[PDB]
Fold this protein.
Amino acid sequence: AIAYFIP
Amino acid sequence: NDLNREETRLKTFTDWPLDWLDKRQLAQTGMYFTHAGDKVKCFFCGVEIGSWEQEDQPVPEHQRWSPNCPLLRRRTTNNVPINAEALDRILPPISYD
Ligand SMILES: [Zn+2]
């Protein structure tokens, strides 16, 4: 999957 | 009645596009549906994950992109599970990384 936002 | 509750997170999964990826396990592990494509977001660490592939798993992918999530790391959070034992069963085993 793809992280559209990473902390 | 916030997304800190698993029950509330599960109800955000209306019109979930992926029959093969379990919405119940995603809601159980902090995720709520953003209603944009197949993107979900964690209420505890804020990570957003979408464009899921059939080989991806709820917890591993969550752990992959957000290693320090309070929920996954088994720290105290304001999460309210539907079933506590089921949550303990699915969260990553403890380990100091
Ligand atoms: Zn998280």
In short: Chain A touches chain B through seven residues (CB under 8 Å). The pocket of zinc ion is lined by residues B 30, 42, 44-45, 47, 62, 66, 69, 71-72 (CB under 6 Å). The longest strand of chain A covers residues 2-5.
